[PDB]
């Protein structure tokens, strides 16, 4: 992403929506739901907050943090080597290696009995209140505004209170800014493109970046002169 994420609160999006005299029955309560539906459906990794925590494993099981949404990696605490996901169908089950993990809910299922792991995960930025804190980026703000407008105009079209050309134009005006908001948060910066250029340009290829925490991924690959 080129732009930094400045955070502003959720009632920023209702300054914009209640400029429209047909969207004047929106609350924060609908916008709390319709922003979580937008933060999720875009899947933008520059919106979530990267946190790292050390959890300990009791017997192939560990308690996972409460604010987790997506795990980046899980590495051992003593070695530092990272755990691949588990393909095993019979993990902790006994009969009569490269370690792996698996997560469903608030549980992580590991392949090792008694250890400590680090978890690099992602969470939502919150407030003094317990509320989502969204970017200030006016392309993220404008397609979030067109999202809640499209989801409020759909109810007003199903009720028979909005013409077919008004929902058709909002569905078109949003679908441009949804593809645009993808490209704001995805396209690498001038600094992030050197991390790709030093990864894409490798005379001797580096294919074991997952054992480290992708630390040496963007390192420039130097060759000696003879």
């Amino acid at each position: 992403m080129v732009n930094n994420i400045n955070w502003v609160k959720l009632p920023v999006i209702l300054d914009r929506l209640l400029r429209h005299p047909l969207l004047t029955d929106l609350n924060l309560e609908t916008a709390i739901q319709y922003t979580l539906d937008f933060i999720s459906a875009m899947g933008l990794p520059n919106v979530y907050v990267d946190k790292i925590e050390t959890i300990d494993i009791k017997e192939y099981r560990g308690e996972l943090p409460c604010d987790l949404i997506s795990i980046n990696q899980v590495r051992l605490h003593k070695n530092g080597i990272a755990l691949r996901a588990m393909t095993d169908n019979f993990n902790a089950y006994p009969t009569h290696g490269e370690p792996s993990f698996k997560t469903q809910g608030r549980v992580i299922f590991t392949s090792i009995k008694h250890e400590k792991v680090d978890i690099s995960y992602k969470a939502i930025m919150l407030d003094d209140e317990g509320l989502p804190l969204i970017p200030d980026n006016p392309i993220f703000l404008k397609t979030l505004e067109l999202y809640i407008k499209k989801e409020w105009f759909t109810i007003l079209f199903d009720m028979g209170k909005i013409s077919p050309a008004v929902l058709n134009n909002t569905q078109q005006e949003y679908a441009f800014k949804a593809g645009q908001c993808n490209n704001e948060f995805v396209i690498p910066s001038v600094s992030e493109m050197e991390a790709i250029t030093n990864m894409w340009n490798q005379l001797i290829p580096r294919v074991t970046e997952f054992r480290r925490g992708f630390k040496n991924l963007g390192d420039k690959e130097y060759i000696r002169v003879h």
């Binding site: 028979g160 013409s163 077919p164 050309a165 058709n168 134009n169």
Partner: peptide, 28 residues
């Protein structure tokens, strides 16, 4: 005599169907 609360809403509902049809022909 006089009462105009059904001839209103039957003339008003006649006018919804004109404009709901008129906005149904609007194409960008």
């Amino acid at each position: 005599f006089g009462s105009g609360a059904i001839g209103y809403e039957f003339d008003n509902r006649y006018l919804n169907n004109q404009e709901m049809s008129a906005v149904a022909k609007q194409r960008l």
